[PDB]
Design a protein around this nucleic acid. Structure first.
Ligand SMILES: [Mg+2]
Ligand SMILES: [Mg+2]
Ligand SMILES: [Mg+2]
Ligand SMILES: [Mg+2]
Ligand SMILES: [Mg+2]
Ligand SMILES: [Mg+2]
Ligand SMILES: [Mg+2]
Ligand SMILES: [Mg+2]
Ligand SMILES: [Mg+2]
Ligand SMILES: [Mg+2]
Ligand SMILES: [Mg+2]
Ligand SMILES: [Mg+2]
Ligand SMILES: [Mg+2]
Ligand SMILES: [Mg+2]
Ligand SMILES: [Mg+2]
Ligand SMILES: [Mg+2]
Ligand SMILES: [Mg+2]
Ligand SMILES: [Mg+2]
Ligand SMILES: [Mg+2]
Ligand SMILES: [Mg+2]
Ligand SMILES: [Mg+2]
Ligand SMILES: [Mg+2]
Ligand SMILES: [Mg+2]
Ligand SMILES: [Mg+2]
Ligand SMILES: [Mg+2]
Ligand SMILES: [Mg+2]
Ligand SMILES: [Mg+2]
Ligand SMILES: [Mg+2]
Ligand SMILES: [Mg+2]
Ligand SMILES: [Mg+2]
Ligand SMILES: [Mg+2]
Ligand SMILES: [Mg+2]
Ligand SMILES: [Mg+2]
Ligand SMILES: [Mg+2]
Ligand SMILES: [Mg+2]
Ligand SMILES: [Mg+2]
Ligand SMILES: [Mg+2]
Ligand SMILES: [Mg+2]
Ligand SMILES: [Mg+2]
Ligand SMILES: [Mg+2]
Ligand SMILES: [Mg+2]
Ligand SMILES: [Mg+2]
Ligand SMILES: [Mg+2]
Ligand SMILES: [Zn+2]
Lengths: 105, 61, 213, 159
RNA sequence: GCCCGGAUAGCUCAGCUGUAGAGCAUCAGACUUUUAAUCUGAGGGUCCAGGGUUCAAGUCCCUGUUCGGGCGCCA
RNA sequence: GUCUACGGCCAUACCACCCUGAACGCGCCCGAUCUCGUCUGAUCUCGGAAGCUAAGCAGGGUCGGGCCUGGUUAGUACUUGGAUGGGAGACCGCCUGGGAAUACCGGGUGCUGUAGGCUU
RNA sequence: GUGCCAGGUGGGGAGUUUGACUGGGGCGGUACACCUGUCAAACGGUAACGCAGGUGUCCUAAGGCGAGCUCAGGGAGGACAGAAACCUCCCGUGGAGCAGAAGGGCAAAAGCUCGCUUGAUCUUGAUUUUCAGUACGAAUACAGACCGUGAAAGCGGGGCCUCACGAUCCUUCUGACCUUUUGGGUUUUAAGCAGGAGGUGUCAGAAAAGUUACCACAGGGAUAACUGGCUUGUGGCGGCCAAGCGUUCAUAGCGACGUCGCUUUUUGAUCCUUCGAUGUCGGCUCUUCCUAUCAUUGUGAAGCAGAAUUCACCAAGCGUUGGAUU
RNA sequence: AGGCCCGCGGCGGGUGUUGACGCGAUGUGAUUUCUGCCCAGUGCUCUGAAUGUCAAAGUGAAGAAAUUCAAUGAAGCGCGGGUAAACGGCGGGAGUAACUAUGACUCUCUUAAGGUAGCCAAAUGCCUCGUCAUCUAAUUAGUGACGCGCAUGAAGGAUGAAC
RNA sequence: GAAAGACUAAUCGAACCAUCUAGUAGCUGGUUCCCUCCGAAGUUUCCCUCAGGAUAGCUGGCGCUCUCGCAGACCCGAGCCACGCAGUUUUAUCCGGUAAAGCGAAUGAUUAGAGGUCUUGGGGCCGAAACGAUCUCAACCUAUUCUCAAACUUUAAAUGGGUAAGAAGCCCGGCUCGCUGGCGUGGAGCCGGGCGUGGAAUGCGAGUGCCUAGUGGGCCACUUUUGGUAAGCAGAACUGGCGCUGCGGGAUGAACCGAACGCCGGGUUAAGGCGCCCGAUGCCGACGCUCAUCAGACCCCAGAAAAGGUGUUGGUUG
């Protein structure tokens, strides 16, 4: 799918519709000091082998794309996450389609 | 191995053993699901029913 | 390689026509339904004899073909090749299926028994009701006994019980023989080919004045 | 093995009648629905919004809530061995007033009128409607004509 | 998910920040009794895509598409 | 007796062809400065009032098609409930109630609400 | 070299697992989560490894609004131009299109083309669908903001409707000048509250390869292999019609196309009995029974001259053998 | 200071009172005659050559510290050779000779190499009770022969007395 | 272990002894006195679920809240006759797309002629010459014609599904509202008042709470119905039954027909029977049909078809 790099949508901090820069959200790096990670490391230390399940039965081929919106107001740089439906090909601000044109021969 | 899949045999008899009772139609239905704007104005009317009591009793008398 | 007709005699299933859902149907055994002098005019063959089933059953296309051939041969022998016209009034539109089993000494050879038992199209049969006409023969009025004998011979190619009935209609039309002549005289009927066109007394008067002229 | 789709089996239920497609006539929108009145749920298929489920098509309920385009209807639904009063939001295209209720209110008004009139004029009158009584005795004149003799016709095969 | 590395006439290979080159494609000609196989020449590079560094980009730095490795794996 | 504007039901109103149309009206019609749109003032928008009912429109006509409503089809087809009914079966008959649809044959061809005109 | 830690190798050894449905299991398939038409017996519901199909996507427009048009096809015309290039008129109830399967729906539409846009946004509840009236998913009607569009009425919180999807724990990101961080304070860090995402397709969601004929246990006739039982497709044996064969002649003897049966000496189908066991092939031996008769007794028919042979009837009394190979 | 092996542990123990004509680990199976081609795959092994990746520790930097980042870079794995008496493997389709029939021969596609010498309906061949000959009156048996051999074949092939 | 998973004290694909240990078992077997009362389920949803659970349903127990009154000390009523309910009808009113029907109505399938006139139809015999001509067969069109549809349909039943048949109703006034708005508008709520012929039939006393076992293999019959040649096969719908049920009849028999059950006497029946077994025709029963050298003889049901007969009996047409 194609979505523009900017959109005018509601900003919760401003409380009104504002322009928003749109990027794609990527999962951040694991903290290694998150409580579950600490519990997992303590559990894994020692003998006993693997103590938690490892999924290894992948079935989905796509992910739900998450749009990171950022209000363009200089005093309001508030961010929001919008998820759109599952898609295989996603692009930001691609070439917009035309109607009455010739297809490449 | 295989077995029966589905049936509604004897189900009607089970249903009618204790009767298929209609819902108990009782006065003063609940106001659940009613339009909230209409409900809040209704609440305001009920709240302010107190005033005009003297006029109401004068008309009654 | 055809099963006996007793396995498909009865109208047990819903009608199963050859359509966009039932594909791969082999062609029916009977392709010709009209024989004799089909171009004969209406007044040429005033006598009509029908063969009428008394059972609600299924007649196979091969049986219809055999009965048609038998009746045609007897009619050609007796009344001559241009002295009759026959019309088969049944079309094999119902597809009968077969769940083919391996005819070898083994059930381990992926026979599967009754699993996935829906069959492949075996053939086509025609569904006939009580009182429905199977064959019709129109000819001269003096060939009544020959028509009866031809239909009697054709009866032996079919499973159930059939009756031979000399109809009161004129030929293959739907109008009674006694009224046919005066209806044509007063131009309520107009001959064309092997049939008559009924001309009602309504419509434009131009169609009325092209007649009577 | 049946699917659980919301519109499975509604092929003819939600189809329009013959030669009655196209624009929805506006009197249906012009109808007035108050709270407490009795409506029949039909469910035309030209309007896809606010459609009732197929289990409420042909049912009758009482209006409890009115919005801009729809109404809230309390309609009885039988589920296994119990009947429960479901509340459904249905757009006004899919409902119409109940002539059974209309006739009943007409009869109530007419009965009250008869009660008032009969108390004014003294003589008692019957208001409870009775089932069809047995036919009373009566005379059938022949008018000097002998009734026609009927006999069963002989059998003959026609077609 | 991480660290690397390759994409260049049809093919292979080189390569400045101040001239895209070389050997094999292909072809027209020059020969030789036919041949050779040796030249004269034509014909080709999306120098993988985008952005920025840019008087100066294939070249410098990031973001994208594939191709190879080696890592790591709690829904 | 009609029309115009806005309608309700949405063919008894539609479709084809023909005839008639007084007065208002509705139109066709004339023009492109302004408003506004076009390849084109054809459409749309605008400004008009020479001519015309030719067309739209209205009414009528057609042994007209369709549509609507009846009769026939037919107490037929089908069907609720019943029998230790018949028949090898396929199926069929009876009792108890309900009850269709073609073909074919008739009749009809918009009704009406609000507001405003014309018609001696 | 030894002691301790780190990385690699490590079936030498250890522990465990090696889905389900299923006309027995396996192989096959997915009927395992969904959607359309039918089945389905005119409310709704309704099954088979029932039938015909589809789904794990796609779309900054194919979302939203407004405006203006009319589509498929056909007829008649126009330089090159022809069956198809473009232009014009006429007919055209949709016979086109609306992303896809199918069904429904739709014409100054919901289709096509333009213009402006982001209601595919921020929120709380209620409700419908499956339903246990639990959840998810999807959907309907509202209400409160902030907007888009249009002159406006209005319409819009995704796709005309019916499908297009996912708990706990954990991780990641976003928001509150928010709460806690343990005697107090500041600051990092961590924990929390609310909302998205990373997925469990066995789709209410374990983390999972084989083999056993060396095998074991608890059971199962809920379930196969052998008999028996129902059936008779297939096998076998008959009948009806008679187009033909029979030097001519349908029927001495045969019988195409059709069609009606019988039998349980074939093989299937099923799984009712038997899994705290009915000893499972063949041969040998021995007895009895059936007749659909090979011979023999008595007959009828012939395309019966005799001889031989063929068809049929009464008929199972009697007989139906010795061997090579397996 | 070793190979192979035991061992909870000891510089413990077996081979070993041993030393390559020896110990240890495999395969094949006397003699005779041979033992063909393939290092692509999986193993094993040799070399580290700039070398890519690569843990802990160590080093440097930022920070107030926890911590984060960077640089460096052991084996192994990649990269490069060898090895089949290591495990193993060892092809198709067309046309073609003056009767026909075969196909010496010729085209291509492809492999890491296309099964060589031999042997065969063999204890290995479905079709199959193969075909021909012999043995019998008669042989799904036996033997001899043939060979596009479902699916023969070389550390095992083919023979050969004695048992 | 010169190899067979052989041997290791009758034990070896991991000896023997004791202990953990009464290991675990969704699987098999058993589970102890009497009478009385009530009395099932094999179905829904979810589950690595399909020999099991949870869940709803079906069951029992405990109640509780109400309704008719409790009548005359023998006796004697002195328009109107309970809250409410229903596997039922009636009266209104909707809903539906099956059976049937239809295809000279759409969408598909499909038979045969007939009439027309254009064309890259074949062509056509003497037409090249402007097929001077017009003969045939095509395609096409038009009006007809035969036969069809689970996944077609204009039309369209029977049976069926919902709702209503009043006191929570009807009708008068008046008040409140921040909702709506030309309006004393609309809507909703609230407050008084008056109306009883209790506004179809029939029957029945209702409402409500807690706890809860067993079950979660079903099978059969009429009818509808899917797969299959069929099946005492496999799968559904409706009702009833068996399971859980004895009794009379079907000789016999889980399901058929009758009828359901405390222990008895008398009477009468059902279904079925009445030669004898074996109760009852031991009627002076009625009218016919039928002779079988395989007669026939009663739902389920326990054996038969097509085709024949100058056997006999009726009947139709000529
Ligand atoms: Mg079950
Ligand atoms: Mg069937
Ligand atoms: Mg007419
Ligand atoms: Mg009847
Ligand atoms: Mg192991
Ligand atoms: Mg039904
Ligand atoms: Mg239904
Ligand atoms: Mg529009
Ligand atoms: Mg809003
Ligand atoms: Mg929508
Ligand atoms: Mg699940
Ligand atoms: Mg069994
Ligand atoms: Mg047979
Ligand atoms: Mg002959
Ligand atoms: Mg025994
Ligand atoms: Mg025994
Ligand atoms: Mg005999
Ligand atoms: Mg050795
Ligand atoms: Mg070798
Ligand atoms: Mg290294
Ligand atoms: Mg080598
Ligand atoms: Mg060889
Ligand atoms: Mg061989
Ligand atoms: Mg052998
Ligand atoms: Mg021998
Ligand atoms: Mg040999
Ligand atoms: Mg040789
Ligand atoms: Mg062994
Ligand atoms: Mg124990
Ligand atoms: Mg059990
Ligand atoms: Mg239906
Ligand atoms: Mg039908
Ligand atoms: Mg049709
Ligand atoms: Mg069954
Ligand atoms: Mg069974
Ligand atoms: Mg039981
Ligand atoms: Mg019971
Ligand atoms: Mg009983
Ligand atoms: Mg009995
Ligand atoms: Mg009996
Ligand atoms: Mg008694
Ligand atoms: Mg008796
Ligand atoms: Mg007696
Ligand atoms: Zn902001």
């Amino acid at each position: 799918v194609n979505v523009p790099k900017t959109r005018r949508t509601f900003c919760k901090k401003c409380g009104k519709h504002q322009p928003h820069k749109v990027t794609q959200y990527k999962k951040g790096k694991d903290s290694l000091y998150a409580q579950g990670k600490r519990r997992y490391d303590r559990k894994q230390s020692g003998y006993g082998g693997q103590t938690k399940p490892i999924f290894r039965k992948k079935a989905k081929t796509t992910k739900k794309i998450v749009l990171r919106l950022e209000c363009v107001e200089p005093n309001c740089r508030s961010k929001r996450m919008l998820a759109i439906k599952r898609c295989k090909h996603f692009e930001l601000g691609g070439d917009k389609k035309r109607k009455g044109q010739v297809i490449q021969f | 191995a295989k077995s029966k899949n589905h049936t509604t045999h004897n189900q009607s008899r089970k249903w009618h053993r204790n009767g298929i009772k209609k819902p108990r139609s009782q006065r003063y239905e609940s106001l659940k699901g009613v339009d909230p704007k209409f409900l809040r104005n209704m609440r305001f009317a009920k709240k302010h029913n107190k005033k005009g009591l003297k006029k109401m009793q004068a008309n009654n008398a | 390689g055809r099963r006996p007709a007793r396995c498909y005699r009865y109208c047990k299933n819903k009608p199963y026509p050859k359509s966009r859902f039932c594909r791969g149907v082999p062609d029916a055994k009977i392709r010709i339904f009209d024989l004799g002098r089909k171009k004969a005019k209406v007044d040429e063959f005033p006598l009509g004899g029908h063969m009428v089933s008394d059972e609600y059953e299924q007649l196979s296309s091969e049986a219809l073909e055999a009965a048609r051939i038998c009746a045609n041969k007897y009619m050609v022998k007796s009344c001559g090749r241009d002295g009759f016209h026959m019309r088969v009034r049944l079309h094999p539109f119902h597809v009968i299926r077969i769940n083919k089993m391996l005819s070898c000494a083994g059930a381990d050879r992926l026979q599967t028994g009754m699993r996935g038992a829906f069959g492949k199209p075996q053939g086509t049969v025609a569904r006939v009701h009580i009182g429905q006409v199977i064959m019709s023969i129109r000819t001269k009025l003096q060939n009544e006994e020959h028509v009866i004998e031809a239909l009697r011979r054709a009866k032996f190619k079919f499973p159930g019980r059939q009756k031979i009935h000399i109809s009161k209609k004129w030929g293959f039309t739907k109008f009674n023989a006694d009224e046919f002549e005066d209806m044509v005289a007063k131009k309520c009927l107009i001959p064309d080919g092997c049939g008559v066109k009924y001309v009602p007394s309504h419509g434009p008067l131009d169609k009325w004045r092209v007649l009577h002229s | 093995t049946n699917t659980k789709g919301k519109r499975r089996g509604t092929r003819y239920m939600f189809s329009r009648p013959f030669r009655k497609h196209g624009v929805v006539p506006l009197a249906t929108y012009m109808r007035i629905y108050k709270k407490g009145d009795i409506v029949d749920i039909k469910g035309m298929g030209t309007v896809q919004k606010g459609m009732p489920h197929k289990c409420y098509h042909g049912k009758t309920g009482r209006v409890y809530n009115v919005t801009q385009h729809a109404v809230g209807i309390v309609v009885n639904k039988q589920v296994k061995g119990k009947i429960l009063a479901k509340r459904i939001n249905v757009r006004i295209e899919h409902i119409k007033h109940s002539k059974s209720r209309d006739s009943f209110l007409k009869r109530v008004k007419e009965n009250d009128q008869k009660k008032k009139e009969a108390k004014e004029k003294g003589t008692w009158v019957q208001l409870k409607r009775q089932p069809a009584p047995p036919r009373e005795a009566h005379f059938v004149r022949t008018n000097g004509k002998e009734p026609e003799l009927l006999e069963p016709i002989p059998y003959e095969f026609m077609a």
